[PDB]
């Protein structure tokens, strides 16, 4: 159909290729992001396809700034590109304004980037969808940026394989008054509910934004929530 | 065909059929002959007539006091290549006051024609050229083709109906080396007459000649000038 080219409309006014990009999304590894009352928790799956792959040598949760965390559901290299771009954009905002960039501004800048990859006749959009967790002026923010160049506000969401299960789960088992620990518990619970196969320190990785600072939990902490809990 | 749209696409034969189609476009042009001796290098062209009240088109060009050409191809490509040789001989005379050697000019022609043959969306130069010159190393006759190949030929003929002329040149190659200017030019005129149908023969309308020598600047003789060369030459009996 109208998919071999990106810069032409369909008779129904549908950009078909970008929905193929969205179909590439949700085919990747599952991931879930939830806004608690205080913190913002993004959990993702990191099972190694074999014992060859070193679970302690690679990461998927990435701090763009000391108050911004990024998680994704898509092929890795495009996520690396957009992480590099987001880090440089946050640093350039810091240079311009001498202020740490708030969550919404960085999110809209990255969305504008993912936009600029949605035109022309010799390129393709990123096949990745992104959760951005951030702290801004004492307020926690969770955002989703998707290959179309648009972005959405979520107190909770998930994508990847079994993502509809995640939507149902966070619809049932969630309230915005969640404490941080119960929020991470909900995150691992929805990760498992979407998951297939065992989950331990080596299989999951999570990142928590708190207004003082954002940090990616160590595999040991991911196990402490992951095992002996739930 | 699947593999015949651009020169960038190879064929399973190990060939580029578009280059061969450029060769055929060259073959579409009228016949031209080139031959050299130890005294002179001469080229002659069969000026295609357009009507009894229109000028028979020029097929021999002059670009240098010691260098000349005879063309067979799309006139635009050949004449802009002619401007290219204008540029190079003029800048060489600027650089070191040297009449540009024919061999290096022909090599530059081939190298420049090579660029389209390996890039998408740009036609290789659909003309065949015979180049005559005299230089500090010898007399020179070269032929260049859209495949960017360039050759040195003691005798050569390119264009339509050329096969008879090429065979005639093969026969009289044993002569040309020590032949004088008059002998060489008359043999070249007969080489051209070999191409023509039975009812078509050498006349000032269809014939153009260009001569370069160790003692004369390369000059193109047309119209009245052709008359003394043809007069006294043997007519064609049936």
């Amino acid at each position: 159909g109208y998919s071999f080219s990106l810069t032409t409309f369909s008779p129904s006014g549908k950009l078909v290729q970008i929905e193929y990009a969205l179909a590439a999304v949700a085919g990747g590894a599952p991931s879930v992001g939830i806004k608690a009352a205080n913190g913002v928790v993004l959990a993702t799956e990191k099972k190694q396809k074999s014992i060859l792959y070193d679970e302690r040598s690679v990461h998927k949760v990435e701090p763009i700034t000391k108050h911004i965390g990024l998680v994704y559901s898509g092929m890795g290299p495009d996520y690396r590109v957009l992480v590099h771009r987001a880090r440089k954009l946050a640093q350039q905002y810091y240079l311009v304004y001498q202020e740490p960039i708030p969550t919404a501004q960085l999110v809209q800048r990255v969305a504008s980037v993912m936009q600029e990859y949605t035109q022309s006749g010799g390129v393709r959009p990123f096949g990745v969808s992104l959760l951005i967790c951030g702290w801004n002026e004492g307020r926690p923010y969770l955002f989703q940026s998707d290959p179309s160049g648009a972005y959405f506000a979520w107190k909770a969401t998930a994508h990847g394989k079994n993502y509809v299960n995640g939507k149902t789960f966070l619809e049932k088992r969630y309230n915005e008054d969640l404490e941080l620990e119960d929020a991470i518990h909900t995150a691992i619970l929805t990760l498992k509910e979407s998951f297939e196969g065992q989950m331990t320190e080596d299989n999951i990785e999570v990142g928590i934004c708190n207004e003082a600072g954002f940090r990616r939990l160590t595999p040991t902490e991911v196990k402490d929530y992951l095992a002996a809990i739930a | 065909n699947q593999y015949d749209n651009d020169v960038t696409v190879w064929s399973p034969q190990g060939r580029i059929h578009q280059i061969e189609y450029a060769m055929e476009a060259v073959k579409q042009g009228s016949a031209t002959v080139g031959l050299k001796s130890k005294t002179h290098a001469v080229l002659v062209a069969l000026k295609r007539a357009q009507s009894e009240l229109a000028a028979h088109q020029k097929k021999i060009l002059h670009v240098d006091n010691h260098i000349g050409i005879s063309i067979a191809g799309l006139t635009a490509d050949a004449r802009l290549l002619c401007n290219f040789m204008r540029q190079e001989c003029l800048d060489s005379r600027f650089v070191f006051d040297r009449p540009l050697p024919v061999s290096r000019l022909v090599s530059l022609i081939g190298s420049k024609t090579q660029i389209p043959t390996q890039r998408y969306g740009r036609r290789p130069y659909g003309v065949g050229l015979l180049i005559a010159g005299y230089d500090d190393m010898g007399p020179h006759i070269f032929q260049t083709c859209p495949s960017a190949n360039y050759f040195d030929c003691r005798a050569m003929s390119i264009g339509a109906r050329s096969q008879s002329a090429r065979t005639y040149l093969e026969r009289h190659m044993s002569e040309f080396m020590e032949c004088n200017l008059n002998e060489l030019v008359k043999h070249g005129l007969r080489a051209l007459r070999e191409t023509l149908p039975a009812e078509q023969d050498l006349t000032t309308k269809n014939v153009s000649i260009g001569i370069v020598g160790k003692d004369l600047e390369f000059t193109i003789y047309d119209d009245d000038d052709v008359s003394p060369f043809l007069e006294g030459l043997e007519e064609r009996p049936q």
Binding site: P11, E19, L22, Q144, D146, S148, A150, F152, T157, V164 | -
Partner: protein, 250 residues
């Protein structure tokens, strides 16, 4: 479909059942009607019922049946279909998803598609033997169709079939539950309210699913709970999610 059914009674039934007025008026009878709406909105049902009451014959050919793999075959099919209809006394011709052969073709083979739609238009335009002969056309999402058939001398009228509303959902649920063994304590109105934007066919679906829930449990009776879990299976639009739900085609 009471409003739609009334319009189609007028346009179809009146010339066939009472031609004398059109003789007294002198005006030639209207030829056909196009029906457009989301798929499953009772278009074929309405045409079939109209043919049944009008007592004339029902002949059907979907647009997808017309295409064929050879040139000169759609024209033959259309012409011989008209021959069949004429030979079959008063008759209504029904063609479902006519848009399949009527659409944007100026883009550019495609030749036989035009040679078929033009032939159909020629058959209807020449009012060929139209003594009690009528045609009915059906389309999903009218927009893809082309005006070549709707041009004034050609087919005369259009009827819209929006998704059933609360009252329409009430009817359709009642009609398709009339044969099923229902139980006291049922509250079908809550069920109709719980199914916003049904296309009518999926209400036949909800009745079917409630009965399937009864059957797989070997029960020959249905209850409120059975229908309520059926409707969950009938949602199927929860498969929209982040993709294009509120972005792009928001």
């Amino acid at each position: 479909l009471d409003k739609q059914i009334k319009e189609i009674k007028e346009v179809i039934e009146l010339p066939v059942k009472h031609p004398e007025l059109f003789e007294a008026l002198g005006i030639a009878q209207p030829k056909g009607v196009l029906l457009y709406g989301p798929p499953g909105t009772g278009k074929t049902l309405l045409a079939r019922a109209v043919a049944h009451h009008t007592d004339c014959t029902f002949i059907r050919v979907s647009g997808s049946e017309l295409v064929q793999k050879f040139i000169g075959e759609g024209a033959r099919m259309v012409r011989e279909l008209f021959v069949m209809a004429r030979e079959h006394a008063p008759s209504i011709i029904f063609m479902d998803e006519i848009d399949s052969i009527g659409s944007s073709r100026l883009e550019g083979g495609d030749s036989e598609v035009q040679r078929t739609m033009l032939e159909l238009l020629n058959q209807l335009d020449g009012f060929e033997a139209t003594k009690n002969i009528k045609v009915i056309m059906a389309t999903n999402r009218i927009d893809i169709l082309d005006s070549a058939l709707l041009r004034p001398g050609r087919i005369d009228r259009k009827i819209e079939f929006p998704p059933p509303n609360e009252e329409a959902r009430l009817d359709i649920l009642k009609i398709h539950s009339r044969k099923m063994n229902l139980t006291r304590g049922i509250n079908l109105r809550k069920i109709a309210e719980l199914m916003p934007g049904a296309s009518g066919a999926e209400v036949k679906g909800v009745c079917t699913e409630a009965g399937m829930y009864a059957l797989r449990e070997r029960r020959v009776h249905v209850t409120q709970e059975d229908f309520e879990m059926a409707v969950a299976k009938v949602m199927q639009k929860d498969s929209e999610k982040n993709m294009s739900i509120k972005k792009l085609w928001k």
